[PDB]
Design an enzyme around this catalytic site. Structure first.
Site, mmCIF file in Angstrom:
data_model
loop_
_atom_site.group_PDB
_atom_site.id
_atom_site.type_symbol
_atom_site.label_atom_id
_atom_site.label_comp_id
_atom_site.label_asym_id
_atom_site.label_seq_id
_atom_site.Cartn_x
_atom_site.Cartn_y
_atom_site.Cartn_z
ATOM 1 C CE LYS A 294 -8.624 64.017 50.813
ATOM 2 N NZ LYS A 294 -9.622 63.641 51.860
ATOM 3 N NE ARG A 371 -11.324 53.300 54.833
ATOM 4 C CZ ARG A 371 -12.488 53.742 55.291
ATOM 5 N NH1 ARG A 371 -13.516 52.911 55.383
ATOM 6 N NH2 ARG A 371 -12.618 55.008 55.667
#
Ligand SMILES: CC(C)C[C@@H](C(=O)N[C@H](C(=O)O)c1ccccc1)[C@H](O)C(=O)NO
Ligand SMILES: CC(C)C[C@@H](C(=O)N[C@H](C(=O)O)c1ccccc1)[C@H](O)C(=O)NO
Ligand SMILES: [Zn+2]
Ligand SMILES: [Zn+2]
Ligand SMILES: [Zn+2]
Ligand SMILES: [Zn+2]
Ligand SMILES: [Zn+2]
Ligand SMILES: [Zn+2]
Lengths: 511, 509, 516, 51
Positions: A294, A371
């Protein structure tokens, strides 16, 4: 389990406050039709002015004190207005020469107060308390609130009033409420206090930095919570996770110095069981993104200890359920907890990993780590043989572009379950909006080599695509997915919201 | 003390040149009134011209009739533009081949810090392409006692060439003609010392991070202390844990090199009327951590330079240990570690505890210097000193504020600031005073910790960082010298060794 | 007075200005504390501290000429409250005449000497008590020590924050300014002279604020020059507004190029104050007047660019006109002041000037444009040449020039550069007495070489990130033999949290003109 | 996406969406975000500063 350290100064447990000053507040509810006593403490009137915007303040409640009645006369109060959130309070002597404070908080010109409107009113009150050394607060409701909104008031008041000082180096003892039909609202008081702590408990877990709150320490705290409540608890370690073949979940944590830990709490009714419910929470104690680091402007990596908010929401629900002890219900509280880090041992973009249901998955972005872990949790959940599986997760930053920071989105494969959650959103006052799982986008997850893609290349609409992914790991059970990525963190107040705790609890209690 | 390796071909020490060809140079100084003679080598005249565009050159003196080459008629064809130069080779009276020339020094009469540097580079250029054994320099301009030393120091430094890491000549004599020569003689050996201190720092900074790591750097400090004669103490992880230096230890968690706290100490044989602590940022490589330096402009290939403060501190130790000053006690400090990306690294958001009990919320792992400096300042103050001066490549904002020539100094006490500024004047390493604005302190108010590491906003990055550090000095005069902008020479692709002369002039005065 | 051009008829043709503010209607009375305080009608507020004891107890220490109010304010009662900076509390009680009065305090901390920021924090708390309350009278009691300047600063700031700009509101407005202000302080007669001095400084500041806050469709080169003319007329100042034809004659190629892409003709503002006395010092004040900085072909399209804020790029001009008001009102002696601003708009067009274009200033220097977003120094260059021909002792310019100011000094301190230490030190001194903080920054000559152009006499920009210093180096080339200073207020002009202008510079520049 | 101030109209939009086979989904108008349009000088802001 023993929390690994790099140096001896690394913390080995998450500090948790169980006995909060809020738990010390005796709450009394009186009926408004009988008039108000303003002896001790601080007395606040909640006033509006329907049809006149920022209109003058007018108190309309008889107060059994001559000194305070003169203060509250219309000629004097017209010097203030009812603009939502506006406040004034004065210190004065009453008839028996005791020091008291009296004031008001503006509740606007709109009869019907919303979930947001009530929050701003509460904050205005809280600002006065953080400047107040008095022992009693009395709140007079010259506005309309249903039983639920009144409970929401207490929950919110409790939540904001409390201040977290665990990493740092004159609370009131009494709360008085004048409200109409007082006896109907009294039952909401202790229910609120429970909902309060569940939310604040989750808040403490989220607010805890990643060096304090790690997969091991969070799982330990979960056990400690389970022991205090009495819930069946089980922590699955790497060896068992390997024999359950949870490859997606296990891959995510490879680069961490902390072993993967799977949290499984259980509430079982002494009754006979007419509903089995599994609650699934995203448990990433820190999301660096992995090799998809990130680093982009806006990634908010300083905020990424928050990526276990879903899990925290589930434990928050566990406190409430374990405390209120509903009947006829069996609840499983699940979270595949890990840390998403950069290392020689980390998993790579392009890696194909195998979930516990045999499906091969091609990883296209390691920052889509949530996920992958949820996939294995959902496979774990469905084998339990439950009626409802509800997952809650800070899954996609895209929610900020769609619903924003106030409303969470709910997806699902079953309309009734989705409807129950929306109903739960409406009685818990944690706002949720139903968003579609658009099947036409399913083809974007078709991998050339693996069974399914982790992410799309294409279809910005990532929140739906992430749901399409998750849907592939629930075979034959009613399932719903709540993305709380936009709503989990309160950016203005620089703190968590503890979102989801009351939502999930209302879902298990009213079903 | 043993440097850990990943493969056997990994260096286990920093190569250091102590005996440079500069230390081998014979220097003698004469008065210009006696005339100049041009026996061997190359003779250079430093001339200016008030009323130039730049204007023509005119020499003035040479006891060899070649006086004719330097005649006004021939020299008028060349101009005195600052930095311009020409040299010609000829036969003298003794039928020996000699080379003669000029370097233009503009028209501003009193030459500045930067301009004199331009003169030196021009001088050094002729030395780098010529096989001279002696250089003679004639000052037909007027300079201070201090600026002359600066001339010599800069000359030596620019002339010296670092070849430690190459696989694939120097003059032995230096002559200087200047007036009132007897007044300048004391400045010569002081210059050579300042030269090596500066060049030594340059050597440490330029050393790549695989060569220069927390262990190899602390070892060099000991070797420096030993040759010098300085008391030394090196803190390893176990004594840092003791001491509860959590801010400093978090930064190094992701490194394969254990943290090493360097503590050199000089004590004067005099009686001590000043106790001084010099503290340097010692990040052997700044990757940025999980806030990886991936944005354009981060210059991550240069981040071996992030121990320049530390290098300046050891360089000062050399000068101090050699010149042996009176009535002063000096502590040379640097908390050395490496900021890397790992499973073991500290993360954005982590709350860590400094050695004074203050809890710190990390907002950017790339704000690593102030974390290590925080614990160093606590330690520094515990020595019970009168002055604390820290020097650090802390902020890139300095490039936007003062640029690449002037460093910024912040502080809590105007007298200490005054001494540093005075030292800047006599050391000729330019520094400018910047304010610590208390109005910005609130941007460090953390929701959870005692204090934030950074602001979230307030682009006054250098001032906010100074505000951060000030919280770790309770009752001592402290000044903070930010060399993030001045440390590296981008044009020449080498270090400056900035601060060594500044810090030394500070202890001497 | 020129005609403001329109694209459609709905385009505004003047800048709305509030001259007569509710502040001007406020009667201010000053009393000495030794005579005691009367606790009136309205709201009476005590400014209290506790020296050397942090968040310490409140103690009132001024005789209150009321037995009932003295009893309430006896410290038995007051020590439940603390003096933490910014803290405030309201009191309700009945006085000796059986009348209902309101009393309270604002905590002034424990530091004895309040800084300008601290006092602002004090004032902000005072304004909260004034807002949402329909008071007719406000009374302030000084139980803290402030010098004459800080006391004036109190009033100036109070008036400023209390005032609300509603010029551009139509369907949004609600509730009522005080008509009376009472002040209790010791040695009151020495402080009385500061009251009207504050009222003037306030409005000069608010006037500058109004112009800056005015959007670029309202505040354009024509409408701004019109407002300046109108101001000069109300103050009896000599004015002259130079249009394109005169600027052409004067060969101001740098200034004229910047405005080529605008639909508004360039307007050069020249106001003058002359004392009837004999003039013993002449001063030229130059303000950057870019009514909107789009950046031109170097369009402000990068993320940190703040393109919606760029109506504020005429803050320099605003401070200067604000100074003209104060000077025009106080009428200093033995002084001649020129208020100058080269006003234009930096736009994108077929007519716009280009990156790379070489232009000729009024002093003959050719300039190679490397970035059209560095337009301010180009206008200041011709303005500075114009300024020096006037034959002045001092040239002081003020400008929102470089965003680097945010990285260097931040949002609280402005930077000053200069060629003369005595002038720099008079400006810094003015900062102290005006309490508008300014810090001296260096003009580094080593950086001059990067302005060495291959084809033109000089480059507009460097290719060395020290932007504020390089811009100062540029400007220095357009002042040959006159004392000159440059105030970079790019970082301090706009209050981002409050979402408004500060009117920074008015009091600083005014104090500078007055104390010699 | 469809937004609106009236449920009867919105559902009619949804009903037409069903029979026209041009898919539309109902999204909320969240009043809590209204304050981000509070302008300092004008009656209202054009945009937010709430992504
Ligand atoms: C991360 C800290 C802010 C320190 C950092 C720094 O200044 N980084 C920024 C960047 O170059 O992106 C920056 C430069 C100038 C102005 C604003 C911001 C410095 O390079 C360092 O890492 N010191 O340890
Ligand atoms: C670029 C100019 C020479 C002056 C300009 C400036 O300094 N801009 C900033 C900077 O250079 O630091 C900036 C540029 C791009 C993106 C963000 C911020 C100032 O805004 C102006 O145009 N003044 O007229
Ligand atoms: Zn992620
Ligand atoms: Zn995540
Ligand atoms: Zn860094
Ligand atoms: Zn660094
Ligand atoms: Zn510009
Ligand atoms: Zn501009």
């Amino acid at each position: 389990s023993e929390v690994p350290q790099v140096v001896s100064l690394d913390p080995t447990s998450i500090p948790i406050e169980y006995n909060t000053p809020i738990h010390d507040i005796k709450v009394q509810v009186y009926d408004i039709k009988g008039g108000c006593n303003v002896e001790e403490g601080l007395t606040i009137f909640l006033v509006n002015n329907p049809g006149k915007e920022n209109g003058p303040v007018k108190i309309s409640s008889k107060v059994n004190d001559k000194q305070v009645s003169e203060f509250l006369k219309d000629e004097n109060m017209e010097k203030f207005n009812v603009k939502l959130g506006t406040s004034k309070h004065f210190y004065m002597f009453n008839d028996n020469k005791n020091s008291v404070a009296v004031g008001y908080v503006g509740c606007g010109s709109v009869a019907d107060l919303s979930e947001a409107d009530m929050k701003r009113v509460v904050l205005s009150l809280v600002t006065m308390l953080h400047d107040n050394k008095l022992s009693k607060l009395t709140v007079v409701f010259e506005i309309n609130v249903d039983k639920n909104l009144f409970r929401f008031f207490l929950e919110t008041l409790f939540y904001e009033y409390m201040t977290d000082e665990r990493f740092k180096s004159e609370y009131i003892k009494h709360l008085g409420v004048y409200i109409n039909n007082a006896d109907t609202y009294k039952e909401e008081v202790e229910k609120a206090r429970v909902y309060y702590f569940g939310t604040y408990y989750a808040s403490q877990l989220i607010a805890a930095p990643s060096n304090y709150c790690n997969p091991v320490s969070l799982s330990n705290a979960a056990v400690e919570l389970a022991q205090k409540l009495n819930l069946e608890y089980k922590i699955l370690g790497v060896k068992e996770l390997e024999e359950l073949k949870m490859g997606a979940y296990l891959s995510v944590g490879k680069g961490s110095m902390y072993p993967n830990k799977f949290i499984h709490l259980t509430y079982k009714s002494k009754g006979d069981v007419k509903k089995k419910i599994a609650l699934v929470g995203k448990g990433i104690t820190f999301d660096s993104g992995g090799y998809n680091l990130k680093a982009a402007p806006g990634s908010m990596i300083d905020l990424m200890k928050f990526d276990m908010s879903g899990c925290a929401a589930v434990l928050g629900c566990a406190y409430c359920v374990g405390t209120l002890k509903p009947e006829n219900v069996e609840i499983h509280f699940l979270s595949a907890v890990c840390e998403n880090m950069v290392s020689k041992n980390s998993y790579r973009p392009g890696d194909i990993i195998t979930a516990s249901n045999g499906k091969t998955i091609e990883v296209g972005n390691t920052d889509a780590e949530g996920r992958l872990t949820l996939a294995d949790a959902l496979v774990y959940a469905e084998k339990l043989g439950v009626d409802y599986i509800v997952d809650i997760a800070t899954l996609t930053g895209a929610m900020l572009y769609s619903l924003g920071t106030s409303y969470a989105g709910v997806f699902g494969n079953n309309e009734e379950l989705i409807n129950k959650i929306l109903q739960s959103s409406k009685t818990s006052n944690e706002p949720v909006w139903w968003l579609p799982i658009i099947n036409e986008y399913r083809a974007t997850l078709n991998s050339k080599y693996a069974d399914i893609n982790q992410i799309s290349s294409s279809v910005k609409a990532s929140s739906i695509v992430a749901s399409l992914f998750l849907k592939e790991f629930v075979q034959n059970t009613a399932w719903a997915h709540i993305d709380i990525a936009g709503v989990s963190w309160n950016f203005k107040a620089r703190k968590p919201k503890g979102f989801g705790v009351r939502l999930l609890t209302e879902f298990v209690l009213n079903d």
